Design a protein around this ligand. Structure first.
Ligand code: HEM
Ligand code: HEM
Ligand SMILES: CN(C)Cc1cccc(NCc2ccc3ccc(N)nc3c2)c1
Ligand SMILES: CN(C)Cc1cccc(NCc2ccc3ccc(N)nc3c2)c1
Ligand SMILES: C[C@H](O)[C@H](O)[C@H]1CNc2nc(N)[nH]c(=O)c2N1
Ligand SMILES: C[C@H](O)[C@H](O)[C@H]1CNc2nc(N)[nH]c(=O)c2N1
Ligand SMILES: [Zn+2]
Lengths: 410, 404
């Protein structure tokens, strides 16, 4: 019937149409000839003339005034005029605090790869647009961590540092997350710690950090204020909450000495709002257990502990058909959940998370006529079809405000 | 441009140039990606261009391009289309086309096997009764007492202004699904509609959870006819678990032969509306989807209860634990019965080898990531970490509407 993508849920047999994708102003990587939906970072996902800026600005101001039900109002028209003026005189413009708050939330709401978006309306937005030094960025980040960690009762938050400005250096956090374990390349070619972090680890060393030699050394932050060499800051150990991993029934699991940090705080993404670019805007939520238990601990190119655990479980690792990988992976995920619960640190299992995302989809269908969703990222890395999202068709597209990938500062 | 394609586990990069040979649009646009949708939303110069392209593919394959034979064959095809509006394939072209369609199937993880396919030419078939005879022989050959062999049987092509040959069943072997007026379904809920069609065509139904359906076979412009399969033709595996003795008590079983029968085979513009094909199962199809899907047999909770798992909460991972034991039981039972099956680790490992073979051979491989990655233990398999490019090449297997 309708001229919009028809979306089907194969478990429930129910049908929706996505009308929200018509609001997309930015092209993704796919064409009628070939789909590139499985690519992590296609060129059409990597990242001004006042005409371009103003149209993006006017679109955002329209979104804002819609969200507060004042579209067409005199205040709506005046805000528009005021933005056009700023841009005419300065080349850029500035967001009111309530527009920044709305924009940050909408960027999270818009993120197709995030399964946690049921929470989108509950985001504490810290305005750090007054920050003027790397030391001050550090102070702001520490406050973020303390507020967000909240002794294990985690709270979603974002801290927004000053926007990109014409002919001035960017504010940048070099680290990809506020909390990351070191990866030390060994003289034999292997890696001690997290192989994901070899590059940032070496950068920290080049910039003066004295490296340790454990599997779980917390990295210092490399913080860059405009037109300045990045500076090195060590997080006070007591600010970094970690959870030692144990298993509810396998007593030997604790002896493995595994652990993970409580706070997933992503720090290298660009926050874009109405054409304005916030190159430093770290945000944090809480973990879904599979991120830790499946990806971080079991990816072959990460900690890669699957075989070690399988051996402790006395499984047959010389043959695929024993499903030793599947058995070990399940017990590792269970250990993560059990350990976080025991430590009273917020965590969500992949079943609870995907059920809540289905509720989010229903909410958004009514509120906006759709929800951009990247199926490959939404479906968890273990037990895929055991979760409701597997059976849900999704439509993926780019809406703004958006969190976007940005090239590394070096 | 042509896409850069990365493997995140290995760091290796390829470029897919094969996608440039696609002459068929998928569902995505720059505005929105529809890569996770199961089904697509919806004359003479056209036919001739598809035909010439396929004939060119065929002679290129046998290292005889530009030969006198190649040039004459194109003339045959053109003469036929210009005079009759259609044309006909030689057996050897049909054999080549059936193999290429499998090779080109973006959703199939078993494509390492693509060059090994027994092709039965059933184009001399004029009746539903004859279709049945061919189908029985297909099943007999492919089953091979448990040493499964891939096969396809090709019934006559669609023709202008004449109804199609069709097999109404979605697979040659399916279990009945009986709708209870108390909402529920007994058997396989995926098969309620086909079960009801069989009944109204005069099938006397059973009332079990694993009653094998009769076939409904249709010759052009005729009501379909009902044919019960001889039970000795249908190999089934009773399911037991290597250590959990109670599992056998569940009374579960599955059939050996996965034989998809409702897809359309397109070769050189020609369409084969009945062309059932079969391989062997990957264990997750049975253990995970068929048995654990909420809208299928849905046995997770039953198994979880017997394992004495805490069902009160998701965070006990009862679902994950039960699914793993169910997949293991399928693997164990098929192995015990000497019936061919491949686990999802072995299968995805073979597919990565296939990807490498195809990169060298054709400069890429169309793959549908959402279907290639197995439905349990995704990131535990190498295909999870492999970027893939999805596109439609011809010869192709396609969906077609149900004949009712
Ligand atoms: C509140 C609890 C949250 C949960 C359970 C959650 C869950 C997840 C998960 C599992 C992923 C996939 C991560 C991966 O595999 O690397 C993800 C991605 C993402 N999340 Fe959420 N998230 C939460 C909060 C937030 C917040 C507060 C923001 C921003 C304000 C956010 C923005 C994003 C973005 C932009 C991505 C995609 C990142 C990328 O493309 O690399 N999330 N989330
Ligand atoms: C030889 C062993 C084979 C294995 C292990 C295998 C494996 C698989 C699996 C696991 C799927 C996903 C199906 C689903 O989830 O429902 C699939 C799909 C598919 N396979 Fe294969 N396959 C084999 C043989 C074949 C053969 C012989 C053909 C055709 C000649 C074929 C053509 C296809 C097609 C067209 C699909 C997609 C069907 C659809 O979209 O519903 N496969 N295969
Ligand atoms: C590479 N950058 C995008 C930063 C980075 C580093 C390491 C992992 C990830 N994952 C993306 C991501 C983004 C936001 C998240 C929010 C909550 C959460 N639990 N995981 C989340 C995961 C992101
Ligand atoms: C819905 N129709 C496309 C037919 C149908 C009915 C029931 C199941 C499936 N699954 C698709 C399918 C196709 C080919 C396969 C080949 C081998 C295999 N092991 N499974 C395979 C599965 C397909
Ligand atoms: C190649 C593939 O796109 C890649 O491995 C993706 C798949 N899905 C994912 N899903 C999530 N949530 N996070 C990831 O990092 C990835 N990686
Ligand atoms: C909605 C989603 O596309 C649908 O559930 C897909 C996902 N991936 C799949 N993968 C395989 N192998 N088989 C399937 O039927 C499906 N179904
Ligand atoms: Zn796409």
């Amino acid at each position: 019937g309708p001229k919009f993508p028809r979306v089907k849920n194969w478990e429930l047999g129910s049908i929706t149409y996505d009308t929200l994708c018509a609001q997309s102003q930015q092209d993704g990587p796919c064409t009628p000839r070939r789909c590139l939906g499985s690519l992590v970072l296609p060129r059409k996902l990597q990242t001004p003339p006042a005409e371009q800026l103003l149209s993006q600005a006017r679109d955002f101001i329209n979104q804002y005034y819609s969200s507060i039900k004042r579209s067409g109002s005199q205040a709506h028209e005046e805000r528009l005029q005021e933005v056009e003026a700023e841009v005419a005189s300065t080349g850029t413009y500035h967001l009111r605090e309530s527009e920044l708050v709305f924009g940050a939330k909408q960027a999270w709401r818009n993120a197709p790869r995030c399964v946690g978006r049921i929470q989108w309306g509950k985001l504490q937005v810290f305005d750090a647009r007054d920050c003027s030094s790397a030391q001050e960025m550090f102070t702001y980040i520490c406050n973020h961590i303390k507020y967000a960690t909240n002794r294990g009762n985690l709270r979603s938050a974002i801290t927004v540092f000053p926007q990109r400005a014409p002919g001035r250096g960017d504010f940048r956090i070099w680290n990809s997350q506020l909390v990351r374990y070191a990866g030390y390349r060994q003289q034999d070619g292997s890696v001690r710690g997290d192989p994901a972090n070899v590059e940032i680890t070496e950068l920290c060393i080049q910039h003066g950090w004295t490296p340790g030699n454990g599997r779980f050394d917390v990295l210092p932050l490399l913080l860059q204020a405009p037109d300045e060499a990045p500076e090195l800051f060590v997080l006070p150990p007591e600010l970094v909450l970690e959870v030692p991993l144990e298993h509810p029934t396998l007593e030997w699991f604790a002896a493995l000495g595994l652990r993970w940090y409580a706070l997933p705080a992503v720090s290298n993404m660009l926050l874009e709002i109405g054409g304005l670019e916030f190159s430093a805007a770290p945000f944090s939520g809480w973990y879904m257990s599979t991120e830790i238990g499946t990806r971080n601990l079991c990816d072959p190119h990460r900690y890669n502990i699957l075989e070690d655990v399988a051996v402790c479980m006395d499984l047959d690792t010389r043959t695929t058909s024993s499903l030793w990988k599947d058995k070990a992976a399940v017990e590792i995920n269970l250990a993560v959940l059990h350990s976080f619960q025991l430590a009273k640190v917020t965590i969500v299992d992949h079943h609870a998370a995907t059920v809540s995302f289905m509720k989010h989809l229903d909410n958004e269908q009514k509120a906006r006529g759709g929800c951009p969703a990247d199926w490959a990222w939404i479906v968890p890395p273990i037990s895929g079809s055991l979760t409701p999202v597997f059976h849900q068709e999704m439509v993926n597209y780019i809406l703004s405000p958006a969190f976007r990938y940005q090239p590394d500062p070096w």
